[PDB]
């Protein structure tokens, strides 16, 4: 149930995705979560509910459900805070607002430095993301601080495409690998290229948007859809469980953690019942097949961004 780290601690390899969670249902969400097995919890600032998350894990802390050292609770650097002088306070902010004294795993949410302000997506006045000229390495000398500072246990990285993984792990002086790369993966985008070349680094890798982001806010009415694709409805039905539960064992067999989203309870207790029973290799490489490179989580705004991570292949 959990995958070792080159921190050398143990990741969960389920979690709760918080991304859209509406603040006032989200610490039910949390709360459920919790009582039905999840110890990992994935957050992130720029969600704008992570107080509203810290209420619920605080709770089960008090009442001593869960105790802190079982609990993986995951945050994100917002764009908006690479300079160096400002990671810390960042680091802080989500702590506050998590009621914690540590992160297990702090990533840094995009390889996109923005100017630091109040907006999340500082624009020019023809729509173009402002950039930061903060270099991701010293960024990432930042994020190396906070290990030291025992703010956080682990640090990682998000939507790094190969080459941006490379220049981390190739940066002079590095004192921390990352431990986490945090992708977007299901089986309409499989990422086979990315994942190896992580493993092989001995970075883990976490799946978002495993049941392709079905709330998102930009779904049109005629995009693909994995939860009603009758290809993986077969699957699942062959196995006696839903389309989503396959969707989320899916990831796991290959060796990645998974964050489905959900603040629906039975959904959540849902996609926590996948520990009991496996996918074969041939229904693996059956939703391998499924690719079609279609990707969820992109900006225009930010397509001439000097470190938009997505023009490269992988
Ligand atoms: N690092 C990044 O840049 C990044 C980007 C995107 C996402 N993420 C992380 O990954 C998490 C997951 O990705 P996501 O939120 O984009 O989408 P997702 O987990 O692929 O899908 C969430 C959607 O699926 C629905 N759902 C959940 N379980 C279901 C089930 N058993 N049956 C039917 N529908 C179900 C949810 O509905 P209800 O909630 O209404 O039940 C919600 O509409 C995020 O919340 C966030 O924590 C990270
Ligand atoms: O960030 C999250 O965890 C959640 C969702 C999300 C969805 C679409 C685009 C971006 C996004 C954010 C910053 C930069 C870019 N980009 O460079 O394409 C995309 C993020």
Same mark, same amino acid.
């Given at each position: =149930?959990?995958?070792?780290?080159?921190?050398?601690?143990?990741?969960?390899? /389920?979690?709760?995705?918080?991304?859209?969670?509406?603040?006032?249902?989200?610490?039910?969400?949390?709360?459920?979560?919790?009582?039905?097995? %999840?110890?990992?919890?994935?957050?992130?600032?720029?969600?704008?509910?992570?107080?509203?998350?810290?209420?619920?894990?605080?709770?089960?802390?008090?009442?001593?459900?869960?105790?802190?050292?079982?609990?993986?609770?995951?945050?994100?650097?917002?764009?908006?805070?690479?300079?160096?002088?400002?990671?810390?306070?960042?680091?802080?902010?989500?702590? =506050?607002? /998590?009621?914690?004294?540590?992160?297990?795993?702090? *990533?840094?949410?995009?390889?996109?430095?923005?100017?630091?302000?109040?907006?999340?997506?500082?624009?020019?006045?023809?729509?173009?993301?402002?950039?930061?000229?903060?270099?991701?390495?010293?960024?990432?000398? &930042?994020?190396?601080?906070?290990?030291?500072?025992?703010?956080?246990?682990?640090?990682?990285?998000?939507?790094?495409?190969? *080459?941006?993984?490379?220049?981390?792990?190739?940066?002079?002086?590095?004192?921390?690998?990352?431990?986490?790369?945090?992708?977007?993966?299901?089986?309409?985008?499989?990422?086979?290229?990315?994942?190896?070349?992580?493993?092989?680094?001995?970075?883990?890798?976490?799946? %978002?948007?495993?049941?392709?982001?079905?709330?998102?806010?930009?779904?049109?009415?005629?995009?693909?859809?994995?939860?009603?694709?009758?290809?993986?409805? &077969?699957?699942? &039905?062959?196995?006696?469980?839903?389309?989503?539960?396959?969707?989320?064992?899916?990831?796991?067999?290959?060796?990645?953690?998974?964050?489905?989203? =959900?603040?629906?309870?039975?959904?959540?207790?849902?996609?926590?019942?996948?520990?009991?029973?496996?996918?074969?290799?041939?229904?693996?490489?059956? *939703?391998? =097949?499924?690719?079609?490179?279609?990707?969820?989580?992109?900006?225009?705004?930010?397509?001439?961004?000097?470190?938009?991570?997505?023009?490269?292949?992988?």
């Amino acid at each position: =149930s959990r995958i070792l780290l080159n921190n050398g601690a143990k990741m969960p390899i /389920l979690g709760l995705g918080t991304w859209k969670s509406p603040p006032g249902q989200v610490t039910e969400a949390v709360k459920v979560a919790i009582d039905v097995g %999840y110890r990992h919890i994935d957050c992130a600032h720029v969600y704008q509910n992570e107080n509203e998350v810290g209420v619920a894990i605080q709770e089960k802390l008090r009442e001593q459900v869960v105790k802190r050292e079982e609990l993986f609770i995951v945050s994100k650097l917002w764009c908006t805070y690479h300079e160096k002088g400002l990671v810390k306070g960042a680091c802080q902010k989500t702590l =506050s607002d /998590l009621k914690l004294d540590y992160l297990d795993l702090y *990533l840094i949410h995009w390889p996109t430095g923005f100017k630091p302000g109040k907006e999340f997506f500082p624009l020019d006045e023809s729509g173009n993301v402002v950039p930061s000229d903060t270099n991701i390495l010293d960024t990432w000398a &930042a994020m190396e601080e906070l290990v030291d500072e025992g703010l956080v246990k682990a640090i990682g990285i998000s939507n790094f495409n190969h *080459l941006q993984v490379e220049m981390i792990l190739n940066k002079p002086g590095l004192k921390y690998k990352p431990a986490v790369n945090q992708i977007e993966c299901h089986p309409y985008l499989t990422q086979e290229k990315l994942i190896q070349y992580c493993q092989s680094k001995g970075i883990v890798v976490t799946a %978002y948007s495993p049941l392709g982001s079905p709330d998102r806010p930009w779904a049109k009415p005629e995009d693909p859809s994995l939860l009603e694709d009758p290809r993986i409805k &077969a699957i699942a &039905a062959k196995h006696n469980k839903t389309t989503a539960q396959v969707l989320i064992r899916f990831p796991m067999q290959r060796n990645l953690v998974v964050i489905p989203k =959900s603040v629906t309870p039975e959904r959540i207790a849902e996609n926590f019942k996948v520990f009991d029973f496996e996918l074969s290799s041939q229904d693996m490489t059956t *939703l391998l =097949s499924y690719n079609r490179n279609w990707r969820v989580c992109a900006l225009l705004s930010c397509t001439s961004h000097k470190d938009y991570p997505f023009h490269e292949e992988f």
